[PDB]
Design a binder for this molecule. Sequence first.
Ligand SMILES: Cc1cc(OCc2nnc(SC3CCCC3)n2-c2cccnc2)ccc1-c1ccc(S(C)(=O)=O)cc1
Ligand SMILES: Cc1cc(OCc2nnc(SC3CCCC3)n2-c2cccnc2)ccc1-c1ccc(S(C)(=O)=O)cc1
Ligand SMILES: Nc1ncnc2c1ncn2[C@@H]1O[C@H](COP(=O)(O)OP(=O)(O)OP(=O)(O)O)[C@@H](O)[C@H]1O
Ligand SMILES: Nc1ncnc2c1ncn2[C@@H]1O[C@H](COP(=O)(O)OP(=O)(O)OP(=O)(O)O)[C@@H](O)[C@H]1O
Ligand SMILES: Nc1ncnc2c1ncn2[C@@H]1O[C@H](COP(=O)(O)OP(=O)(O)OP(=O)(O)O)[C@@H](O)[C@H]1O
Ligand SMILES: Nc1ncnc2c1ncn2[C@@H]1O[C@H](COP(=O)(O)OP(=O)(O)OP(=O)(O)O)[C@@H](O)[C@H]1O
Ligand SMILES: [Mg+2]
Ligand SMILES: [Mg+2]
Ligand SMILES: [Mg+2]
Ligand SMILES: [Mg+2]
Lengths: 745, 745
Amino acid sequence: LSTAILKQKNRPNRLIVDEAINEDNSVVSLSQPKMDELQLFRGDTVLLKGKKRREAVCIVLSDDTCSDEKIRMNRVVRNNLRVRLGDVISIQPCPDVKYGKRIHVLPIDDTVEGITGNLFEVYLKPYFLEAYRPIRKGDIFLVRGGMRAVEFKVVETDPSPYCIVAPDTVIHCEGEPIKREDEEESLNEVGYDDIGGCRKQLAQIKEMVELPLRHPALFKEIGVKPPRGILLYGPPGTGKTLIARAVANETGAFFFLINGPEIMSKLAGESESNLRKAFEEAEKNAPAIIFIDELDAIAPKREKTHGEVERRIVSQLLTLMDGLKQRAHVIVMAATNRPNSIDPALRRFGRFDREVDIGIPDATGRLEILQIHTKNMKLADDVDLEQVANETHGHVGADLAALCSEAALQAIRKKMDLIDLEDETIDAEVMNSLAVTMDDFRWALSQSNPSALRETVVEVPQVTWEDIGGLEDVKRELQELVQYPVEHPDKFLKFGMTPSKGVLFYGPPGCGKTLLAKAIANECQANFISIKGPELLTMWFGESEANVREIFDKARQAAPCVLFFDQLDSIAKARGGNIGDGGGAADRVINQILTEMDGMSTKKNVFIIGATNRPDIIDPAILRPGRLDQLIYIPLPDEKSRVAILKANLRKSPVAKDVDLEFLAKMTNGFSGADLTEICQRACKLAIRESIESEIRRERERQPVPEIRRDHFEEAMRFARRSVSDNDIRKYEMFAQTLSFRFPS
Amino acid sequence: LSTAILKQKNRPNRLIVDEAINEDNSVVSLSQPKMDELQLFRGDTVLLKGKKRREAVCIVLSDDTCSDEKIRMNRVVRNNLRVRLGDVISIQPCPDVKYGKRIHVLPIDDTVEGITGNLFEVYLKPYFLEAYRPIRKGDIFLVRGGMRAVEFKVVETDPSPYCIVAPDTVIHCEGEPIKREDEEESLNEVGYDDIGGCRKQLAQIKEMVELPLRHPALFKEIGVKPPRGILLYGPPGTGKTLIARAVANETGAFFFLINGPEIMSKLAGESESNLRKAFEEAEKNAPAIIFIDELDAIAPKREKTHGEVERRIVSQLLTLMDGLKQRAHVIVMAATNRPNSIDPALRRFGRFDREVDIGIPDATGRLEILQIHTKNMKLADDVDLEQVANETHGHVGADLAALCSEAALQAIRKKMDLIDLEDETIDAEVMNSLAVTMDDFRWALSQSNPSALRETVVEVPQVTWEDIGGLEDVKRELQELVQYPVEHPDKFLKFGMTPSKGVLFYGPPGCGKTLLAKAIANECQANFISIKGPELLTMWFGESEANVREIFDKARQAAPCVLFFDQLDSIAKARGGNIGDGGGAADRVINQILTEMDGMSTKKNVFIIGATNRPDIIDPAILRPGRLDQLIYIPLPDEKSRVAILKANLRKSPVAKDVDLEFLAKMTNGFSGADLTEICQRACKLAIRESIESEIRRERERQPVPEIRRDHFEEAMRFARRSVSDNDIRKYEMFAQTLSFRFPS
Ligand SMILES: Cc1cc(OCc2nnc(SC3CCCC3)n2-c2cccnc2)ccc1-c1ccc(S(C)(=O)=O)cc1
Ligand SMILES: Cc1cc(OCc2nnc(SC3CCCC3)n2-c2cccnc2)ccc1-c1ccc(S(C)(=O)=O)cc1
Ligand SMILES: Nc1ncnc2c1ncn2[C@@H]1O[C@H](COP(=O)(O)OP(=O)(O)OP(=O)(O)O)[C@@H](O)[C@H]1O
Ligand SMILES: Nc1ncnc2c1ncn2[C@@H]1O[C@H](COP(=O)(O)OP(=O)(O)OP(=O)(O)O)[C@@H](O)[C@H]1O
Ligand SMILES: Nc1ncnc2c1ncn2[C@@H]1O[C@H](COP(=O)(O)OP(=O)(O)OP(=O)(O)O)[C@@H](O)[C@H]1O
Ligand SMILES: Nc1ncnc2c1ncn2[C@@H]1O[C@H](COP(=O)(O)OP(=O)(O)OP(=O)(O)O)[C@@H](O)[C@H]1O
Ligand SMILES: [Mg+2]
Ligand SMILES: [Mg+2]
Ligand SMILES: [Mg+2]
Ligand SMILES: [Mg+2]
C-alpha cells in the first residue's frame, strides 16, 4: 500500500502516554502483564523514545491501575520526550548504565530570575540525595524547594550519554544560564506532524530517503539500487522547506542543508569549494542526506545562462552527483518551485531522477494545515476550521499561515482601545482576554488573496450520483465503460478486446455532462482535470498549441485521472459554426489534442472524456479509434428525471412540503436541468427577499418565512423559460440516428 | 477597526497644549483636579513627551484658571517639544533627577551675532542663580539680559540626560556656536503629520512595523509571528521615501537606511560588505528597522540580469533576509516604484511577504497634502485649497509640491520689477509684500503636467442617487443585489442560495448605466474601477489579452470594489456587428474576461458590472452562472423620469422659476438622459453667450442675464433631437421578451 510505511506498528514496546498518579521525574509505571510480556523487572532502567529524535531514561514500576497498552507518565518527562497525553512512545531495556562521574546542569532563566541563593544546596542536593536518578544529556527537569521551583537542563554528563546520579557523582551548575529562547526554539522544532495535506508525499519521501539509508541490506537482498536523487517540486509556499526542516529534525542520518542563495552569494571559487566540502562531509558521515533548497538558484539551464562561473557551478554539481557510487549511502534531496527551470542534465539517470510533487492541498489537506497552524493559537468556540477550510480554495499552506496571522491581527485590532503604543507594558486582563473569534477569521478571509488560484485544479470531485437526477442508463453505461476494465481486466483479456478509453458526451446544454464526468471521476476516486471552452479558446487566439501537451502531462502525473474537455465546439463556434469559415473541421488546438490522445493511448489509468453541445461541427478525427470513440447522448430530462433534478437542486434549500415538485416537472416539458436550477434559484431569491423585508419591517416596528412556498415557485415560473428549442432537439435526434437482422434459422 | 491604531487614547496623562499666563521656561501649570487624578505634587519635576521623539522636563504647578484637560505652556518649551497650541502632549512623573555635575551649552548664531560680551555672566548666571531649573540635553532655551535675548542649546549634561542646575553645577558655553542651519533642519524634520492621504497606509505600517517591535509579547501570547518583510510600492512621488523619513524620525527602534544607488555605486565586494554590515548592525541594536529605499536598484529579476556581481548581490540579500530568526526583532522595510521589477524570490514567505500600496491620492488626500505643504507658505485669503485639490486630478504629492513651488515662483514674477539680480540685497517691503495668491495657483495649475494621469483610477465615485433621475425600481434591484448579501448574509445561508455576483446593464445609450454603476459603488462606499470600450479595443487591436488579468488583480487589491465594464459590445461592433465577421460572438479579450471572472468568483467582496447598448451581439458565455448572470434593462425615461433628469441636470445652473420642466419633459417623448443633458447644456451655452455679449456691450458703452430663461430653452429645443429611434427601442423590447402558472388548488 502507498502509505503502508507511515503505519507504525501495533507492538508491545509501543505504549500510549497516560497521566501519572504518583510518579516523580525519574520513574514510569506499567501494568504487570506488560512487564511479563516485555520481560521487564521492577526497578529496571528503561529507555523511552518519542517524537523528534527524543530519548529519555526512567525506572519501570508496577501499577495495578495502569492499563496494559498505556504508560503512566508525569508532565516533566512528557516535556522531555516532546509528547502529549494519548501519544505513542517506545520502551526498551537500557542495560549497562554506569554511575555518573560528573554532571553539569544549568537552570532556565525565568525559573532562576530573582533567585540569588545557592542553587546546588537548595535544589539539586535534596533532589539527588540517595535517589540514584537516571538522567540524559539535554534533559529538562523541574526541582522543588526554595521559594520557587526551578527547571534545570543537563548540559553535560560523564559517562555519556546516560548516567546514574550516584552519591559520589559530582554535580555542578556554574555557567551561563540556559536562555528560554533556546528552549523554546528546541521545543517548537518542526517534525513530520507539522506537515498537513502531504501524506502521500511523506510516505514517498520515507520510502525513497529514510528507507534506503535505514536498511540498505533490504534493497541489496532484492538486488535493486535505491534512487540517488529526489527532487521536491511544487508552487511556492506548499511546504518544501518545511518538509526539509522536518526531515532534518526527524532523521537518524547525517543531514547537510544547502541553500541556493547560500551558494550563489559567495565569490567565485568559494561556492564550488562549499559545494565540494558539503558533498565530502556527507560522504564522511554516511549515511547522510544532502538537501539543496532552491535548486534553481544554483542550477538553471546552462545554455540559457550567461555567466561563466554559473555554468562552472552547474557542471560541478553534475560532477558531484555523478561521483556517488551508490555505496556512499548519500542521498541528495533538492527542492524547487520552478522544475522546468532546472538544467535537464540534472534530471537524468544517476541524478535527480525521482520527483515528488508537493502540490496544492485540497479541502481536507488545508483543514489539516489550519489545525496544525492554530494548535498553539488562542481560539474561541465559534471558530469552525471546517468552514475556513472549505472557503480557502486556491490557498497553500503559506497562505493559510498568513490568514491565521491576519485573523490574530484583527483580534488585536478589536482590543486596540485598551492597548497603547507608548505604553511600556500591556495589562494582563487584555492578555488573557485576547482570543481569535470566527469573525476575525471571516475578515481575514475577506482580505486574503490566494497565490494558487490560477493553478490547474487536480482533485477528486465532490459531485456524486445523488447530485445527478435521472440519467440511470447513462450512469450504468459510464460505470461499465470506466470500471469494468478496472475491476474485471481478465474478462477483457479473455475475449481479446481492448477497452475504449475515450467517450464523448453530446446533447443539449445544461443536461448534466459536466456533472456526469465529475460523478464518474468521484465514484472511481480518481483525479479530475477539467479543460473548459475558454482555455481552448485562449490557446486558439494566442496560437499557443504547445500548452495542450502540458495538460496531458498533468494527466499523466495525476493518474488515475479523468481528463475532461468541456465544450469541445468552442473553437468551432468561434470560427463561425458550420458555415462560418472556409476551412473545414480542423484547428490547431484540436490537432494537438488528437496527437496527445494518440500519445496517451498507452497510459491505461487515464480516461479522457469530451463534451459538446454541437456534435455536428466537431472534428470527426476525434471520433476515430484510440480517441473519444464512444459516444453518449445526454438528452433533455423527462418528467421523472425532472422530478429527480428538482429534488436534487432543493436538497440544501428549506422547502415547504405543500410544494408539489411533480407538478413543476410535468409543467416544464422542454426544460433542461439548468433551467430547473434557474427556477429553484429564483424561488430561493424571492424567499430571501421576503424574509429580509420582513426582518426589516420588524426591525423598524420595534424601534415569517422559514421555507420556500408555492407562491415563490409560481412567481419564479413567471420568468422561467426553456433554453433549448425543438429545432436543437431535432438536430441532436438526426445526429443520434446517423450514428431486423437475424442469423438464418 | 482598520485605523484603530492611529487612535490616541483619552487618557489623564494626555493634555492639550495651552498658553501660559505667567510661566518661565522651567515650569508648567495644571488644574488641581488634574494633579489629584495624576497624584502629582506641586513643585514635582515632570517629564513631557511630544511629537517627533521629543522629551522635556518641567516643574508642575497649580493654576485655578487652567482647564482640567489643558496644560499651560510657554512658547520656549512649546518649541522644545515641537508642538503648537491645541496639540496633545503626555505628562509623567520624572523621579530620581540628580543635581547636574557639569553642563555645556552653546548659543544660536543670530542670537549671538554682534554679541561680544561674556555670555556666562550676562545671560546664564542670572538665569541659573538660585533657580534649580531642570534641563535636558538638546534643549533650546531663551535668556534675557544684555542688549538682546540669546537662545542657547544644551549640548552636554552630566549626569545625563536629565539634570538639575544646582548652585555648584558647572555651566560653560565655550565652543563652536550652534549654527541656525542645524536648528532649522532639526525643526523641519519629517514626522507622521507630514504625510497626507495615507491614513490607511500609516495605520498598516504601524500595525506591521511599530507594533511587533513595540510589544513582541503581544504577538507571542496569541501565538503568531509578525511578518518580517514589508514592501512599500506605488507610482513615483507618492511619498514612500517621505514615509521612510517619518518612520525614522518617529520610531523608538533603531533605524538603518539603505538606498539602492547607495549600494550599487560601490565596487564589487563593498556593496555586499555594506549590506551584511547593515544587517549585523540592525541585529546588534535590536529592536531595529532596516529600510531599503529603491529596492529595484539592487534586486532586479535574476534571470533578466546579466551582471555576475548583481546576481551575487541579489543572492546575498535573499540570504540575509532568510537569516533572521524572528527573535532578532529586526523588521526589513523596502520601497519600490516598480514592484514587478523585483525578483520574485524576495516576495516569498519569510521575506517581503507583506505589501503596502502607497497609491495615488484622491481629492481629500491631495487636499491634505496641499494643506501640509503650504503650512509654512505665505498665502493670501483668496487661496482656496479646496479648489486646487478638486482641480489636480492625476497629481501625486510630488506634483502638488511642484505646483506650490511654481505658484510661489509666479508670485515672485509678479514682484520682479522691484527685484534685481545684480542687487546684493532685496528690500524688506518686497519681502513682507510677497504672498501667494489664488491667481498664482491658477497659473501653476495651467502650467502643471501630472505624472499619474495614465494610471487607473481606483476610488469611491462622487455620483449619488440624487445625481440619477428616475429608475427607482432599478435602484431598488441594484441595492438588493449588491447589499442584501453584505447586510444579511445569514438569510442567504439559511435558504442555501449563493448570491449572484454579476449583473449586466442593457438598454439604449445615454440612459444612466454608468451613473447606476457609480451610484451603487458610492452607496456601499466601495472602490470603483471603470473599463471603457476604448481600453478593450486597445487590447483587441494590439492583441494584448494578458493585460485583462492586470485589471482583475487591481480589483482584488481594491476590494471591496465594483469592477465595471462599460460598452462590452465595443469589440463586437469593431468586428462589424451581428453580421460583420464570419466568426460568431467570441473574441480574445472577452475570453480572458470570462476566465478572470471564473477566477474572481471566489472573491466575495468584488462585484462585477457590465454595460452594453447592443445585448444581441454580446457573447452569450458572459451570461452563464458565475458570470454576469443577472440582467437589468435600463429603458428610456418616461415623463416623470424625464422631469427628474431635467431637474438633476439643472441643479448647478441658475434657472428662472418661470421655466416649466414638466412641459419640457412631456414634449421630449423619445429623448434619453443624454439628450436632455444636451438640451440643458445648449441652453446654458446660449445664456452664457447672452451674458458675455451684454457685458461686452456695457463695457463698450462705458468707454441682464442672471438666470436661464424660457427663450433659451426654446432656442435649445431648436437643435434638440432624439438619439434613439423606435427601431432600437423595439430591438431592446424583443431582447427583454426573450429573456398563468398556478399550483393546483
Ligand atoms: C484489461 C485492460 C485494462 C486497461 O485499463 C484498465 C484501467 N485502469 N484504469 C483505467 S481508467 C482510470 C480509472 C478510473 C478513471 C481513470 N482503466 C481503464 C482503461 C480503459 C477503459 N476503462 C478503464 C487497458 C487495457 C486492457 C487490455 C485489454 C485487452 C488486451 S488484449 C491483450 O488485446 O486482449 C490488452 C489490454
Ligand atoms: C452570504 C454570502 C455572501 C457573499 O458575499 C457578500 C459580499 N460582500 N461584499 C460583497 S460585494 C462588494 C460590496 C459592495 C460592492 C462590492 N458581497 C457580495 C457578493 C455577492 C453579491 N452581492 C454582494 C458571498 C457568498 C455568500 C454565500 C451564500 C450562501 C452560501 S451557501 C453555503 O451555499 O448557502 C455560501 C456563501
Ligand atoms: N503542508 C503544510 N503544512 C503545514 N504548514 C505548512 C504547509 N505548507 C506550508 N506551511 C507553512 O507555510 C509556510 C510555507 O513556507 P515554506 O518555506 O515551507 O514553503 P516552500 O514551498 O518551501 O517555499 P518556496 O517554494 O517559496 O521556497 C511555512 O511557515 C510553513 O510552516
Ligand atoms: N440531471 C441533472 N441533475 C442535476 N442537476 C442538473 C442536471 N442537469 C443539469 N443540472 C444542473 O444544470 C447546471 C449545469 O449543468 P452542467 O454543467 O452539468 O451541464 P452541461 O450539459 O455540461 O451544459 P452547459 O454547457 O450548460 O454547462 C448545474 O446547475 C447542474 O446542477
Ligand atoms: N502623501 C504625501 N504627503 C505629503 N507630502 C508628500 C506626499 N507624497 C509626496 N510628498 C512630497 O512630495 C515629494 C515626494 O518625494 P518622495 O521621495 O517622498 O517620493 P517617492 O514616492 O518615495 O519617490 P520615488 O518613487 O520617485 O523614489 C516630497 O517632497 C514629499 O515631501
Ligand atoms: N437617469 C439619468 N439621470 C441623470 N442623468 C442622466 C440619466 N440618464 C442619462 N443621464 C446623463 O446622460 C449622460 C450619459 O449617461 P451615462 O453615461 O450614464 O449613460 P449610458 O447608459 O452608460 O450610455 P452611453 O453609452 O451614452 O454613455 C450623462 O450626462 C448623464 O448625466
Ligand atoms: Mg523554501
Ligand atoms: Mg457546464
Ligand atoms: Mg524615493
Ligand atoms: Mg457613459
